[PDB]
Amino acid sequence: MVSWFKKIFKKEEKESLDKGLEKSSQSFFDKVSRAVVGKSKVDDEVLDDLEEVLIASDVGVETTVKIIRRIEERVARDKYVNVAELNNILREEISGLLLENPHAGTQNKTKKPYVIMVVGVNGVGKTTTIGKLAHQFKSEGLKVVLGAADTFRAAAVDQLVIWSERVGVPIVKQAMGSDPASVAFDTVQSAVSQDADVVIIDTAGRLHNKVNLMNELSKIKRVMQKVVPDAPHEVLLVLDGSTGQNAFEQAKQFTAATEVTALAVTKLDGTARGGVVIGISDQFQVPVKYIGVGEKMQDLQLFNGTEFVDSFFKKR
Amino acid sequence: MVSWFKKIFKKEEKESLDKGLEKSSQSFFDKVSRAVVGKSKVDDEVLDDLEEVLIASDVGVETTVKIIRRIEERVARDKYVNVAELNNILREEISGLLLENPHAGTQNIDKTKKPYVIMVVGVNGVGKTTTIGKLAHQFKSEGLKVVLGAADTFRAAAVDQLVIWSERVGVPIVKQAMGSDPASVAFDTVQSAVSQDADVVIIDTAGRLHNKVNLMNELSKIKRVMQKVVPDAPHEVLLVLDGSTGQNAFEQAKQFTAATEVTALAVTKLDGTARGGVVIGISDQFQVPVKYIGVGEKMQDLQLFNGTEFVDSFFKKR
Numbered sequence A: 001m002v003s004w005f006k007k008i009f010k011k012e013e014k015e016s017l018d019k020g021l022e023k024s025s026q027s028f029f030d031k032v033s034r035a036v037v038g039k040s041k042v043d044d045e046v047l048d049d050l051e052e053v054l055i056a057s058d059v060g061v062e063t064t065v066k067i068i069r070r071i072e073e074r075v076a077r078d079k080y081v082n083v084a085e086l087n088n089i090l091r092e093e094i095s096g097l098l099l100e101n102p103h104a105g106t107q108n109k110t111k112k113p114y115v116i117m118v119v120g121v122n123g124v125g126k127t128t129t130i131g132k133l134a135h136q137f138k139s140e141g142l143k144v145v146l147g148a149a150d151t152f153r154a155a156a157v158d159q160l161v162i163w164s165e166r167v168g169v170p171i172v173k174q175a176m177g178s179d180p181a182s183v184a185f186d187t188v189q190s191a192v193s194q195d196a197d198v199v200i201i202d203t204a205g206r207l208h209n210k211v212n213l214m215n216e217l218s219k220i221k222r223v224m225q226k227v228v229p230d231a232p233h234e235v236l237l238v239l240d241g242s243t244g245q246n247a248f249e250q251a252k253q254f255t256a257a258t259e260v261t262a263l264a265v266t267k268l269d270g271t272a273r274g275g276v277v278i279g280i281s282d283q284f285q286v287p288v289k290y291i292g293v294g295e296k297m298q299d300l301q302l303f304n305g306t307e308f309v310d311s312f313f314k315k316r
Numbered sequence B: 001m002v003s004w005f006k007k008i009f010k011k012e013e014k015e016s017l018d019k020g021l022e023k024s025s026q027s028f029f030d031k032v033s034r035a036v037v038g039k040s041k042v043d044d045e046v047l048d049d050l051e052e053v054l055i056a057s058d059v060g061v062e063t064t065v066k067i068i069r070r071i072e073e074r075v076a077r078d079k080y081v082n083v084a085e086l087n088n089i090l091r092e093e094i095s096g097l098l099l100e101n102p103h104a105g106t107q108n109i110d111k112t113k114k115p116y117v118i119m120v121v122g123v124n125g126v127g128k129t130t131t132i133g134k135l136a137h138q139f140k141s142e143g144l145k146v147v148l149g150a151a152d153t154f155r156a157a158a159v160d161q162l163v164i165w166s167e168r169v170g171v172p173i174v175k176q177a178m179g180s181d182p183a184s185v186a187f188d189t190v191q192s193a194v195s196q197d198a199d200v201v202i203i204d205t206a207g208r209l210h211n212k213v214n215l216m217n218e219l220s221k222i223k224r225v226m227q228k229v230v231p232d233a234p235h236e237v238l239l240v241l242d243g244s245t246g247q248n249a250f251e252q253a254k255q256f257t258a259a260t261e262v263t264a265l266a267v268t269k270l271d272g273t274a275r276g277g278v279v280i281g282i283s284d285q286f287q288v289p290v291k292y293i294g295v296g297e298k299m300q301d302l303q304l305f306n307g308t309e310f311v312d313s314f315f316k317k318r
Ligand SMILES: Nc1nc2c(ncn2[C@@H]2O[C@H](COP(=O)(O)OP(=O)(O)O)[C@@H](O)[C@H]2O)c(=O)[nH]1
Pocket: A120, A121, A122, A123, A124, A125, A126, A127, A128, A129, A159, A266, A267, A268, A269, A270, A291, A292, A293, A294, A295, A299
């Protein structure tokens, strides 16, 4: 039974999710409306055109096939279905589909500190997501320590320092080009000495050489295990949802190079390719855990596929 | 030995290719310049950063590995290589690499009896109908008689758009109504070309790739029905790809060529975009040739492909 990471939405939080998905929702409704103009009943041609719309909405081939198969079956049972019901049918069938992945949601604690290694390619929103996470945890009364283990560019450390100041959490850092594993070691040591609750490690994720990537991330993990044997407790892969299915393929490439435990999909706000979240949640054997809906430290949400699909497809 | 589709470039033609690739060339030079600031000699770190630049330039993983392997080897032989030479080294090594694909260029097959039948295929929006207009202009300018077939009949404006191009160039068109059987339109087109003693037939097609079974069946029916009239038609199946989408076009070509037999590639929209490096990866990896590149909206903005000149325009100092 799928247990979502976020079970309760405040009014403002559901509004933030609706707003984050607004452009994707409007784009999808535009495409379906145009596809069924002059049609009355859902037939094989309508479902063919709906498959084309779902693909054009970055839902992905394998997920779209499953969705159309479920709708085909439902249409065959009900015989006469009006095309105006498609948004409602999609909401119901896709919500049901996401609940079928046993790897979605939480699986339901280890000794502090809880160590998070944030991974992904440059530009997807890793460091921003780390700032948002630090805010999430500090708002709960937890003590957060950041580790600046993205040391390839000098700007990288500067950017995490900037976020450490926006939220008001300590940071462990060395120089540009310092050994990332050594920074991670120092970060976890400091967190243990300071009795901190959460450690978040920033990393480079230069995917062009998967051997070097694999070796760097494995060294970071192995060295942290000298201090905390079951660290990292979470390996969070950050993906740019504004790139649609490009993020799905990137996640496939990245998760084949290193062990990931959860996904974050950023930049859903103000872009129209958010349907990729549906395909990722359906196909991946690790959960979507966070979605990003803006530039500010509050613009992070724990994932709930049922609410995501509701916001994506409901009438506005 | 690779024989390019265009062997001689007039000065104006080389200028058109340079201009078409200007943004991709500037973008690449920006990336490599930034990557080697503060460096003097090419070392393993420089080559690693250069691999990242080539990937960021849409050249693709397999092609980039080959390029870096050759540069690694050349650096090892020469021991001391200045980072300023990277542009020259890339031009030389990538030019050599493209000549290694025996499927590149023309195979100089003996001519078949007129009409020469071209089926243009690809996904909506890549520039198929535009490319057909450009092809019609190319052939009419050579003194040939062109006939167009409006066998893209799904959407509202598809037939209208090919009519519009037939009028811009001034060539006849065979068409039916929206939703007409595309194979029947193709049959009528080839029949008309035979009776009019035409030299070239160009068939426009839909390419709804979301259901590859339906796509495969439609294109196969068009081919089979045209063979009732001209047994070796289509003589060319030209897959059009949008070069402004970079490696997305490489992946799309992989998906499309697995659904239907293609004989040649056209890569459009290189002008004014910065992802033209995908042409290098396509030419290296695909077992069908890049034959045409599109460098603009006008009927003249088509060139037969020459990989050596493409790489020269992509990497030469400006
Ligand atoms: N609109 C929006 N922008 C985001 C989101 N997450 C990250 N960004 C932006 O993405 C850009 C790159 O973020 P950064 O944290 O430096 O990416 P990194 O290279 O992966 O560490 C920044 O301008 C962020 O403001 C999001 O959820 N919404």
